[PDB]
Design an enzyme around this catalytic site. Structure first.
Site: not given
Ligand SMILES: NC(=O)c1ccc[n+]([C@@H]2O[C@H](COP(=O)([O-])OP(=O)(O)OC[C@H]3O[C@@H](n4cnc5c(N)ncnc54)[C@H](OP(=O)(O)O)[C@@H]3O)[C@@H](O)[C@H]2O)c1
Ligand SMILES: COc1ccc(Cl)cc1C(=O)NCCc1ccc(S(=O)(=O)NC(=O)NC2CCCCC2)cc1
Length: 315
Positions: A45, A50, A79, A112, A161, A211, A214, A217
């Site tokens: 994704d 990005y 997106k 997006h 999205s 999204y 976890l 970030q």
């Molecule tokens: N459509 C939209 O508007 C939208 C918005 C936001 C995000 N997204 C997409 O969704 C993806 C995920 O969302 P997000 O970026 O908000 O992050 P997320 O998946 O919620 O992850 C957040 C943090 O969790 C940590 N993490 C990952 N695996 C882990 C584990 N097994 N144990 C403990 N910590 C862990 C990561 O740190 P480390 O990197 O240090 O492991 C990461 O920075 C994005 O990269 C993007 O592709 C889309």
């Protein structure tokens, strides 16, 4: 381990999140996307926003070349950014994404965000007083241009999205609609589970994709540092002890068992490989109800520039 979409294509239920803040060198996205594939992620994704599609595209190209995967084994999402909502800008936006990635097609292309912004070479166009310049676009027309991108084979599937129910219905009730959105990618985690949206989405055979599953970030520029830390949650830590897993794996598994497709970002090799272990265990009906009770309507994302937008989804 796929879900069948409403246009007949298949989406892997676990996806890799590629966004990393600009302070992280762009070589990292290439490197970690390879690791993600090596670990067994097949759904990836990304987005024009990005500033990593070239690197993610290259990681994919690399893993095809070294014989680990075929193009057809990878599900790649891009997106359309909100500056390109006007119908004439949609196809060129995609083709630019495709050219950057060196792919012939994306497996999925999303609007997006419903929040249209002034067209141009800004991602963030702002006026003389530093205020974000909104645009006004009939998204039914953006969607028609999305439909043409599918017909042109440039995008195997199309979806949206950050849409709410009313925004979804606008597309669904559109006269002469050719293609339903396959999905709505939204913020979704135990502190904001989107159960009502999920049920609506299920009733229209639209996949909800989570999204920030976890807990985001926690990027200082969009996320209140006083907000609770999802992975520190007692109920999630306790279920992590019960099952001999981690609180991340509890959060991801939650989504899978409620029929949500879930993204996980990590630029750490160890956690990337950990996250594919979501498939190795099962929460009970009661564990799931325990996690259901954690909802607190907490969205990690904030810009009060974006609350004033007429299309702001949380209205
Ligand atoms: N459509 C939209 O508007 C939208 C918005 C936001 C995000 N997204 C997409 O969704 C993806 C995920 O969302 P997000 O970026 O908000 O992050 P997320 O998946 O919620 O992850 C957040 C943090 O969790 C940590 N993490 C990952 N695996 C882990 C584990 N097994 N144990 C403990 N910590 C862990 C990561 O740190 P480390 O990197 O240090 O492991 C990461 O920075 C994005 O990269 C993007 O592709 C889309
Ligand atoms: C620069 C920059 C890059 C990524 C992000 S981000 O928020 O990490 N990535 C997202 O994809 N979506 C955003 C947040 C939800 C609605 C608006 C789009 C935020 C800002």
């Amino acid at each position: 381990q796929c879900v069948k979409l409403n246009d007949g294509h298949f989406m892997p239920v676990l996806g890799f999140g590629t966004y990393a803040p600009p302070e992280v060198p762009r070589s990292k996205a290439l490197e970690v996307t390879k690791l993600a594939i090596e670990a067994g992620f097949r759904h990836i994704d990304s987005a024009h926003l990005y500033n990593n599609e070239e690197q993610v595209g290259l990681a994919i190209r690399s893993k095809i070349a070294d014989g680990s995967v075929k193009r057809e084994d990878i599900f790649y999402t891009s997106k359309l950014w909100s500056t390109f909502h006007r119908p004439e800008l949609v196809r060129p936006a995609l083709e630019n994404s495709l050219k950057k990635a060196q792919l012939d097609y994306v497996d999925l292309y999303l609007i997006h965000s419903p929040m249209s912004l002034k067209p141009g070479e800004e991602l963030s166009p702002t006026d003389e007083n530093g205020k974000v310049i909104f645009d006004i676009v009939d998204l039914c027309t953006t969607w028609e241009a999305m439909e043409k991108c599918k017909d042109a084979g440039l995008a195997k599937s199309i979806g949206v999205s950050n849409f709410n129910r009313r925004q979804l219905e606008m597309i669904l009730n559109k006269p002469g609609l050719k293609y339903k959105p396959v999905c709505n990618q939204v913020e979704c985690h135990p502190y904001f589970n989107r159960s009502k949206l999920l049920d609506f989405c299920k009733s229209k055979d639209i996949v909800l994709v989570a999204y920030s599953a976890l807990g985001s970030q926690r990027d200082k520029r969009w996320v209140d540092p006083n907000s609770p830390v999802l992975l520190e949650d007692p109920v999630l830590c306790a279920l992590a002890k019960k099952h001999k897993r981690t609180p991340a794996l509890i959060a991801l598994r939650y989504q899978l068992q409620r029929g949500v497709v879930v993204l996980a970002k990590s630029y750490n090799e160890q956690r990337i490989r950990q996250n594919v272990q979501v498939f190795e265990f099962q929460l009970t009906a009661e564990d799931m109800k325990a996690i259901d009770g954690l909802d607190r309507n907490l969205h990690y994302f904030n810009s009060d520039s974006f609350a004033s937008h007429p299309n702001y989804p949380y209205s």
